[PDB]
Amino acid sequence: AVVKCKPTSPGRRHVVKVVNPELHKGKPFAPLLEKNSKSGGRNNNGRITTRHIGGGHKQAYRIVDFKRNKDGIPAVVERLEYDPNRSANIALVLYKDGERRYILAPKGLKAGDQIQSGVDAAIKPGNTLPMRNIPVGSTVHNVEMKPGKGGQLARSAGTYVQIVARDGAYVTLRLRSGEMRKVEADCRATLGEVGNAEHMLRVLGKAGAARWRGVRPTVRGTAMNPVDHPHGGGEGRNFGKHPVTPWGVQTKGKKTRSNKRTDKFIVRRRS
RNA sequence: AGGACCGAACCGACUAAUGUUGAAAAAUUAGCGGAUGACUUGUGGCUGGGGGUGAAAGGCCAAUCAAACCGGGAGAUAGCU
RNA sequence: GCUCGCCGGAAGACCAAGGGUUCCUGUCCAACGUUAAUCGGGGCAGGGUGAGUCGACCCCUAAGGCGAGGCCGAAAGGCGUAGUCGAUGGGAAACAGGUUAAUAUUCCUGUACUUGGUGUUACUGCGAAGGGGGGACGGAGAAGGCUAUGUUGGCCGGGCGACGGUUGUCCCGGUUUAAGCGUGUAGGCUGGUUUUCCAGGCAAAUCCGGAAAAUCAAGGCUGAGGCGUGAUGACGAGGCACUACGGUGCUGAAGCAACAAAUGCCCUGCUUCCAGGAAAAGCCUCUAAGCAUCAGGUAACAUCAAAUCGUACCCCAAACCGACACAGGUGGUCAGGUAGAGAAUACCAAGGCGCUUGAGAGAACUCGGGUGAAGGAACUAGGCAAAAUGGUGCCGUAACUUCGGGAGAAGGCACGCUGAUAUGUAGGUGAGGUCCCUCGCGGAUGGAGCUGAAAUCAGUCGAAGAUACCAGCUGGCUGCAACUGUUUAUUAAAAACACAGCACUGUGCAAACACGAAAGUGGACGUAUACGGUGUGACGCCUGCCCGGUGCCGGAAGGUUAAUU
RNA sequence: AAUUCCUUGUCGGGUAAGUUCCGACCUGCACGAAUGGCGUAAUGAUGGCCAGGCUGUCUCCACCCGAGACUCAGUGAAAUU
RNA sequence: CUUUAAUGUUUGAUGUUCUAACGUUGACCCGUAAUCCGGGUUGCGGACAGUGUCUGGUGGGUAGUUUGACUGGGGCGGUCU
């Protein structure tokens, strides 16, 4: 739910929280936990490869099952849980055989509801079926791109994919980015939209909030002496050159897609 | 409840005087700021020189930084002293 | 040796790190000590560090490192699998007292305990590089229940006062006692027991998980403290003989209660919040492959073993880092008394010091401070500095405002001591006693004693009652930046850098991008409500005209145009 | 105007007297709308200005307490030449 | 030997399709009590992609260098036969 904190302090006038009581107010399922130590934007060589990353709050990894290959065995939702490693919330489900697993939580899922995977599953939100058996004009999430590896698209808070057509062993999709992609007509997809849609209306409010997320401050570059950045310096605020990345790339329109390996599944890239 | 309030430890270093072959190759005294947090601290670890890191000052990288230090090319070259 | 003065959340005591004999004793004084030196952290010699329980080694791992093969790479070599190292973390066990010139939870006395090996006996399904469980973990807040400890009283011993008073509501001191064993409370959590079935846990499983029934509601786990035991002991103020006044054997009284009470224990708890909170082993269970009048397991007793290294001393400092016996720097632990909100401040206790040149004189001038006639910022670049303000409670409190603030706005009154209300109140604590009982560390009743505010009235001293130390100057107009923050270690803390927010743009995942000759890694065990880059910089009303130029994104008819031919 | 050369712009405010400050005027040498424009409560060891209190800051110094200076003893440097 | 159409042959351009090269940071099995690697099976792509040699364009991202002299100081201007 949406709620705006009160201006009891400078640092709360603009903070906005996304609260939800349905989430489990307790410890998570340990057997599905894994240590996730932070890196800091560095690599095996120790060099900062991705800037603006460091610190943040400790996190343990919740092993999520994006494949959903347990077919013909229904599961009941035990409880909704909070996962820091992603924006959407997850759901601990209990299979009839006694095995529990985590999944992404669709829009209107609850605790106690049932879901089933496979080719003979029902057409309801939260179910997983190969897109071959999904009608056209439907809406799915956690879409696979190659059969067997697991969902890779529409995994975020409120991201959904819409199926537009089915030509052969392929199907055409419009992703949340407006792009029009095609994938094999056997890649499993999960019905419904990921439910955290109020995650975008959130407001951190203060700088320290972004630092809890493991984010580090962003220094522009215009105040970065010429040795450090192309924009560099100058007496005052000159900036009389083209906007450019560090390492010299435009950043203001220049397209940088150079795959040329797929180059078949793209139809309506965007805009 | 709070990057909330006063204020010690703790962390800093705004003003002044002293000191300036100093007690000290940046301190002392008197006041000053933050003080549940983008806080602070111990231990150990990673990043190596046209590179690192940098809430960015051309700042820091062993009292040394507009390209560290040791050795070597090297008895560089010096129409200048 | 008698005094004086200083620290006393240390300038005291115990450690890590680091140093490595500076420790103790004897002896010496050239040099070292900023002076002398009989002294010394100096020289010389001798002596000193005693562990099954402390720590390390050892078992388990974190970040990370190395890395058989392997992948990649002109060579060197780089990345990395299985694995192996790696604490700053997890993992069995000792307390008190006494003792040496110098060591001790290490020696001695007493009382305990833990993990293993072997053997006898009795009863036996044992077994893993595997499965599960557990270990296992955040921040803040909230009390309650205890203790450490302290105060008073009582008890015991001593004392009757260098000057008035002092046999009394007088004065001084002591009033300590552990681990462990046993008891299982305050209290926290969880519903238990039995039978059957099952796509799960890489196969199996009596374990875990899941489903279905009957049957009982009481079963259990965890748990500070207290009590008892340990303890007819030990220690003990002080005695009595030795007594070189350097010191020894024996003896040694009381050894209770109440109140207050922690930041520490119950508490790895409870409650609540988002930023959602290590791993692995030991340990508890499950069985497989396997072994069965075996081997092995369990239980009791018995016996043996528990090695090796460190252990002195300093450790906010003269012993470590600073070239010095240097106003510096240095992590953790113990945290008394009076007043106080307090770990501030003042004065003190234990204890430890007076800072390794002194003596005198009492000029200018300098430094650090104290007071000041009248005037009161006339000083000065500038109220620089200094002076001033300063506490609790009550009344009261502006424009403006994002309605939270502004605000401790401003400003005003009252603060002592004594007595009474009340021979010490309200409150808090709570014994005996009575009653109850599942007879217990119980519940109720009961209120002794202890403890003790705050206010009112009255009276009273002083120039002055927040009397010391401690301890906001205030207000008004205004620029810039929203704010908290960050920065030029060592002349610049700012209007700069960050910032939440906004926008443009790129990126469909083997993502863009970045580090890399490459492999590969990061981004991310993420997937456009995401990530990267750029600029702007809370919020609020808004963000206008121009695509010629440069760049970017697109597009076509033609022209020009590389290697090649 | 953190931007205004001319310039102490002009008027008014405040002062006995105000190149600074405040508020208006516009002739903006050379503001201007996310290298953002105009406002903005709160905040700030921020810049500037005016008041009350306060004072040895000053008129104008005076006296006093201590540490040095001075003298004796012991030890015993330095820049410079 | 001036000339043009169905075939054979030839190479060259486009188009559709296939799989055997190649790719696979898809699935499963084994080495193997191993998310590396390799092998195998299968699927998806598929002669594209990608790499090598050559070549055009772009290229302060990174380098090595240049940027004169006279001169009533230098610069500016002017001059240099």
CSV table of N, CA and C in Angstrom, one decimal, chain A residues 55-153:
chain,number,residue,atom,x,y,z
A,55,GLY,N,28.9,-1.2,-0.5
A,55,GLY,CA,28.2,-1.1,0.7
A,55,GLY,C,26.8,-1.7,0.7
A,56,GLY,N,25.9,-1.0,1.3
A,56,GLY,CA,24.5,-1.5,1.4
A,56,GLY,C,24.3,-2.5,2.5
A,57,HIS,N,23.1,-3.0,2.6
A,57,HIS,CA,22.6,-3.9,3.6
A,57,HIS,C,22.9,-5.3,3.2
A,58,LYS,N,23.4,-6.1,4.2
A,58,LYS,CA,23.6,-7.5,4.0
A,58,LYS,C,22.4,-8.2,3.5
A,59,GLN,N,22.6,-9.3,2.6
A,59,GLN,CA,21.6,-10.0,2.0
A,59,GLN,C,21.9,-11.5,1.9
A,60,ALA,N,20.9,-12.3,2.0
A,60,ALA,CA,21.1,-13.7,1.7
A,60,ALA,C,20.2,-14.1,0.5
A,61,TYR,N,20.7,-15.0,-0.3
A,61,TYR,CA,20.0,-15.3,-1.6
A,61,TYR,C,18.9,-16.3,-1.4
A,62,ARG,N,17.7,-16.0,-1.9
A,62,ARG,CA,16.6,-16.9,-1.8
A,62,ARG,C,16.6,-17.6,-3.2
A,63,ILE,N,16.8,-18.9,-3.1
A,63,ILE,CA,16.9,-19.7,-4.4
A,63,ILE,C,15.5,-19.8,-5.0
A,64,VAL,N,15.3,-19.1,-6.1
A,64,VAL,CA,14.0,-19.1,-6.8
A,64,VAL,C,14.0,-20.0,-7.9
A,65,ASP,N,12.9,-20.6,-8.2
A,65,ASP,CA,12.7,-21.6,-9.3
A,65,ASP,C,12.0,-20.9,-10.4
A,66,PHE,N,12.8,-20.4,-11.4
A,66,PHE,CA,12.2,-19.8,-12.6
A,66,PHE,C,11.8,-20.8,-13.7
A,67,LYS,N,12.2,-22.0,-13.5
A,67,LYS,CA,11.9,-23.0,-14.6
A,67,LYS,C,10.5,-23.5,-14.4
A,68,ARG,N,10.1,-23.8,-13.2
A,68,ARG,CA,8.7,-24.3,-13.0
A,68,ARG,C,8.4,-25.6,-13.8
A,69,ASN,N,9.3,-26.6,-13.6
A,69,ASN,CA,9.2,-27.8,-14.4
A,69,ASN,C,8.6,-29.0,-13.6
A,70,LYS,N,8.0,-28.7,-12.4
A,70,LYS,CA,7.3,-29.7,-11.7
A,70,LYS,C,5.9,-29.7,-12.2
A,71,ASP,N,5.7,-30.6,-13.2
A,71,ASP,CA,4.4,-30.6,-13.9
A,71,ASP,C,3.5,-31.7,-13.4
A,72,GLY,N,2.2,-31.5,-13.3
A,72,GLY,CA,1.3,-32.5,-12.8
A,72,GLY,C,1.3,-32.7,-11.3
A,73,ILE,N,1.8,-31.7,-10.6
A,73,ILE,CA,1.8,-31.7,-9.1
A,73,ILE,C,1.4,-30.4,-8.6
A,74,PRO,N,0.1,-30.2,-8.2
A,74,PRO,CA,-0.3,-28.9,-7.8
A,74,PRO,C,0.5,-28.4,-6.6
A,75,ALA,N,0.5,-27.1,-6.4
A,75,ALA,CA,1.1,-26.5,-5.2
A,75,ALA,C,0.1,-25.4,-4.6
A,76,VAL,N,0.2,-25.2,-3.3
A,76,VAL,CA,-0.6,-24.2,-2.6
A,76,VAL,C,0.3,-23.2,-2.1
A,77,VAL,N,-0.1,-21.9,-2.2
A,77,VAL,CA,0.7,-20.8,-1.7
A,77,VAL,C,0.6,-20.8,-0.2
A,78,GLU,N,1.8,-20.9,0.5
A,78,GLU,CA,1.8,-20.9,2.0
A,78,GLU,C,1.8,-19.4,2.5
A,79,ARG,N,2.6,-18.6,1.9
A,79,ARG,CA,2.8,-17.2,2.4
A,79,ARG,C,3.5,-16.4,1.4
A,80,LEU,N,3.3,-15.1,1.4
A,80,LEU,CA,4.1,-14.2,0.6
A,80,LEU,C,5.3,-13.6,1.4
A,81,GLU,N,6.4,-13.5,0.7
A,81,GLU,CA,7.7,-13.1,1.4
A,81,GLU,C,8.3,-12.0,0.7
A,82,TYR,N,9.2,-11.3,1.4
A,82,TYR,CA,10.0,-10.2,0.8
A,82,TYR,C,11.4,-10.7,0.4
A,83,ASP,N,11.8,-10.4,-0.8
A,83,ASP,CA,13.1,-10.7,-1.3
A,83,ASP,C,13.9,-9.5,-1.6
A,84,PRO,N,15.0,-9.2,-0.9
A,84,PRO,CA,15.8,-8.0,-1.2
A,84,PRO,C,16.5,-8.1,-2.5
A,85,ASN,N,16.9,-9.3,-3.0
A,85,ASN,CA,17.6,-9.4,-4.2
A,85,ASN,C,16.9,-9.0,-5.5
A,86,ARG,N,15.6,-8.7,-5.3
A,86,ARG,CA,14.8,-8.3,-6.5
A,86,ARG,C,13.7,-7.4,-6.0
A,87,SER,N,13.0,-6.7,-7.0
A,87,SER,CA,12.0,-5.7,-6.7
A,87,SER,C,10.6,-6.4,-6.4
A,88,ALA,N,10.3,-7.5,-7.1
A,88,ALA,CA,9.1,-8.1,-6.8
A,88,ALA,C,9.1,-9.0,-5.6
A,89,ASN,N,8.0,-9.4,-5.1
A,89,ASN,CA,7.9,-10.3,-4.0
A,89,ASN,C,7.7,-11.7,-4.4
A,90,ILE,N,8.1,-12.6,-3.6
A,90,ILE,CA,8.1,-14.1,-3.9
A,90,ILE,C,7.0,-14.7,-3.1
A,91,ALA,N,6.8,-16.0,-3.4
A,91,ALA,CA,5.8,-16.8,-2.7
A,91,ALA,C,6.3,-18.2,-2.4
A,92,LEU,N,6.3,-18.6,-1.2
A,92,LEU,CA,6.7,-19.9,-0.8
A,92,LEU,C,5.5,-20.9,-1.0
A,93,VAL,N,5.6,-21.9,-1.9
A,93,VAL,CA,4.6,-22.8,-2.2
A,93,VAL,C,4.9,-24.2,-1.7
A,94,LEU,N,3.8,-24.9,-1.4
A,94,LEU,CA,4.0,-26.3,-0.9
A,94,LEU,C,3.3,-27.3,-1.9
A,95,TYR,N,4.2,-28.2,-2.4
A,95,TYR,CA,3.7,-29.2,-3.4
A,95,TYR,C,3.1,-30.4,-2.6
A,96,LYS,N,2.1,-31.0,-3.3
A,96,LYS,CA,1.5,-32.2,-2.7
A,96,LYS,C,2.5,-33.2,-2.2
A,97,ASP,N,3.6,-33.4,-2.8
A,97,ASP,CA,4.6,-34.4,-2.5
A,97,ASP,C,5.4,-34.0,-1.2
A,98,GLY,N,5.2,-32.8,-0.8
A,98,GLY,CA,5.9,-32.3,0.4
A,98,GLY,C,7.1,-31.4,0.2
A,99,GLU,N,7.4,-31.1,-1.0
A,99,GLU,CA,8.5,-30.2,-1.4
A,99,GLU,C,8.1,-28.8,-1.5
A,100,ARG,N,8.8,-27.9,-0.9
A,100,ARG,CA,8.5,-26.4,-1.0
A,100,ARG,C,9.5,-25.7,-1.9
A,101,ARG,N,9.1,-24.6,-2.5
A,101,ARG,CA,9.9,-23.9,-3.4
A,101,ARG,C,9.5,-22.4,-3.4
A,102,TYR,N,10.3,-21.5,-3.9
A,102,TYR,CA,10.0,-20.1,-4.1
A,102,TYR,C,9.7,-19.9,-5.5
A,103,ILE,N,8.8,-18.9,-5.8
A,103,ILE,CA,8.5,-18.4,-7.1
A,103,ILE,C,8.2,-16.9,-7.0
A,104,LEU,N,8.1,-16.3,-8.2
A,104,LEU,CA,7.7,-14.9,-8.3
A,104,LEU,C,6.2,-14.7,-8.0
A,105,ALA,N,5.8,-13.7,-7.3
A,105,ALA,CA,4.4,-13.5,-6.9
A,105,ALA,C,3.6,-12.7,-8.0
A,106,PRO,N,2.6,-13.3,-8.7
A,106,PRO,CA,1.8,-12.5,-9.6
A,106,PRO,C,1.0,-11.4,-9.0
A,107,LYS,N,0.2,-10.7,-9.8
A,107,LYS,CA,-0.6,-9.6,-9.4
A,107,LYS,C,-1.5,-10.0,-8.2
A,108,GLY,N,-2.5,-10.8,-8.5
A,108,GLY,CA,-3.5,-11.1,-7.5
A,108,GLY,C,-3.4,-12.4,-6.8
A,109,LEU,N,-2.2,-12.8,-6.5
A,109,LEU,CA,-2.0,-14.1,-5.8
A,109,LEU,C,-2.1,-13.8,-4.3
A,110,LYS,N,-2.4,-14.9,-3.5
A,110,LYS,CA,-2.6,-14.8,-2.1
A,110,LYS,C,-2.0,-16.0,-1.5
A,111,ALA,N,-2.2,-16.1,-0.2
A,111,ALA,CA,-1.8,-17.3,0.6
A,111,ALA,C,-3.0,-18.3,0.6
A,112,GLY,N,-2.8,-19.5,0.3
A,112,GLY,CA,-3.8,-20.6,0.2
A,112,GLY,C,-4.2,-20.9,-1.2
A,113,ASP,N,-4.1,-19.9,-2.1
A,113,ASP,CA,-4.4,-20.2,-3.5
A,113,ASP,C,-3.5,-21.4,-4.0
A,114,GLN,N,-3.9,-21.9,-5.2
A,114,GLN,CA,-3.3,-23.1,-5.8
A,114,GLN,C,-2.8,-22.7,-7.2
A,115,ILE,N,-1.7,-23.4,-7.6
A,115,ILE,CA,-1.1,-23.2,-8.9
A,115,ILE,C,-0.6,-24.6,-9.3
A,116,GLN,N,-0.5,-24.7,-10.7
A,116,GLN,CA,0.0,-26.0,-11.2
A,116,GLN,C,0.8,-25.7,-12.5
A,117,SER,N,1.8,-26.5,-12.8
A,117,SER,CA,2.6,-26.4,-13.9
A,117,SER,C,2.4,-27.6,-14.9
A,118,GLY,N,2.8,-27.4,-16.1
A,118,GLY,CA,2.8,-28.4,-17.1
A,118,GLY,C,1.9,-28.1,-18.3
A,119,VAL,N,1.7,-29.1,-19.2
A,119,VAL,CA,1.0,-28.9,-20.4
A,119,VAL,C,-0.5,-28.9,-20.2
A,120,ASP,N,-1.0,-29.6,-19.1
A,120,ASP,CA,-2.4,-29.7,-18.8
A,120,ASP,C,-2.8,-28.8,-17.6
A,121,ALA,N,-2.1,-27.8,-17.4
A,121,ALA,CA,-2.5,-26.8,-16.3
A,121,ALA,C,-3.6,-25.9,-16.7
A,122,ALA,N,-4.3,-25.4,-15.8
A,122,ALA,CA,-5.4,-24.5,-16.0
A,122,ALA,C,-5.0,-23.1,-16.5
A,123,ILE,N,-5.8,-22.4,-17.1
A,123,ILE,CA,-5.5,-21.0,-17.6
A,123,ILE,C,-5.9,-20.1,-16.5
A,124,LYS,N,-5.0,-19.9,-15.5
A,124,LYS,CA,-5.3,-19.0,-14.4
A,124,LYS,C,-4.0,-18.3,-14.1
A,125,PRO,N,-4.0,-17.1,-13.5
A,125,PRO,CA,-2.8,-16.4,-13.1
A,125,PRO,C,-2.0,-17.2,-12.1
A,126,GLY,N,-0.7,-17.3,-12.3
A,126,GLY,CA,0.2,-18.1,-11.5
A,126,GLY,C,0.6,-19.4,-12.0
A,127,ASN,N,-0.1,-19.9,-13.1
A,127,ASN,CA,0.2,-21.2,-13.7
A,127,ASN,C,1.3,-21.0,-14.7
A,128,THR,N,2.0,-22.1,-15.0
A,128,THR,CA,3.1,-22.2,-15.9
A,128,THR,C,2.8,-23.2,-17.0
A,129,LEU,N,2.8,-22.8,-18.3
A,129,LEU,CA,2.6,-23.7,-19.4
A,129,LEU,C,3.4,-23.2,-20.6
A,130,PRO,N,3.9,-24.1,-21.4
A,130,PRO,CA,4.6,-23.7,-22.6
A,130,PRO,C,3.7,-22.8,-23.4
A,131,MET,N,4.3,-21.7,-24.0
A,131,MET,CA,3.5,-20.7,-24.7
A,131,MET,C,2.7,-21.3,-25.9
A,132,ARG,N,3.1,-22.5,-26.3
A,132,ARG,CA,2.3,-23.1,-27.4
A,132,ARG,C,0.8,-23.3,-27.0
A,133,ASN,N,0.6,-23.5,-25.7
A,133,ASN,CA,-0.7,-23.8,-25.2
A,133,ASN,C,-1.4,-22.6,-24.5
A,134,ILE,N,-0.8,-21.4,-24.7
A,134,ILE,CA,-1.4,-20.1,-24.2
A,134,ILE,C,-2.2,-19.5,-25.4
A,135,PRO,N,-3.4,-18.9,-25.1
A,135,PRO,CA,-4.1,-18.2,-26.2
A,135,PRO,C,-3.3,-17.0,-26.6
A,136,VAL,N,-3.8,-16.4,-27.7
A,136,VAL,CA,-3.2,-15.1,-28.2
A,136,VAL,C,-3.9,-14.0,-27.5
A,137,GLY,N,-3.1,-12.9,-27.3
A,137,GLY,CA,-3.6,-11.7,-26.6
A,137,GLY,C,-3.5,-11.9,-25.1
A,138,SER,N,-2.9,-13.0,-24.6
A,138,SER,CA,-2.8,-13.3,-23.2
A,138,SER,C,-1.8,-12.4,-22.5
A,139,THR,N,-1.5,-12.7,-21.3
A,139,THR,CA,-0.5,-11.9,-20.5
A,139,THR,C,0.2,-12.8,-19.6
A,140,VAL,N,1.6,-12.9,-19.7
A,140,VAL,CA,2.4,-13.8,-18.9
A,140,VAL,C,3.6,-13.1,-18.4
A,141,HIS,N,4.3,-13.7,-17.5
A,141,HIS,CA,5.6,-13.2,-16.9
A,141,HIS,C,6.5,-14.4,-16.7
A,142,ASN,N,7.8,-14.0,-16.4
A,142,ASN,CA,8.8,-15.0,-16.2
A,142,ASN,C,9.0,-15.9,-17.4
A,143,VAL,N,9.0,-15.2,-18.6
A,143,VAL,CA,9.0,-15.9,-19.9
A,143,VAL,C,10.4,-16.5,-20.1
A,144,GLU,N,10.4,-17.7,-20.7
A,144,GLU,CA,11.7,-18.3,-21.1
A,144,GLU,C,12.0,-17.8,-22.5
A,145,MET,N,13.3,-17.9,-22.8
A,145,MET,CA,13.8,-17.6,-24.1
A,145,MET,C,14.4,-18.8,-24.8
A,146,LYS,N,14.8,-19.8,-24.1
A,146,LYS,CA,15.3,-21.0,-24.7
A,146,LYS,C,14.7,-22.1,-23.8
A,147,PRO,N,14.0,-23.1,-24.3
A,147,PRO,CA,13.4,-24.1,-23.5
A,147,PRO,C,14.4,-24.9,-22.6
A,148,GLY,N,14.2,-24.8,-21.2
A,148,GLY,CA,14.9,-25.5,-20.3
A,148,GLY,C,15.7,-24.7,-19.3
A,149,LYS,N,16.1,-23.5,-19.7
A,149,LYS,CA,17.0,-22.7,-18.8
A,149,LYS,C,16.3,-22.0,-17.7
A,150,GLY,N,15.1,-21.5,-18.0
A,150,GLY,CA,14.3,-20.8,-17.0
A,150,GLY,C,13.9,-19.4,-17.5
A,151,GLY,N,13.0,-18.8,-16.8
A,151,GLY,CA,12.5,-17.5,-17.1
A,151,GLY,C,13.6,-16.5,-17.1
A,152,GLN,N,13.6,-15.6,-18.1
A,152,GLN,CA,14.5,-14.5,-18.2
A,152,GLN,C,13.9,-13.2,-18.5
A,153,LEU,N,12.6,-13.1,-18.8
A,153,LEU,CA,12.0,-11.9,-19.2
A,153,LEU,C,10.8,-11.6,-18.3
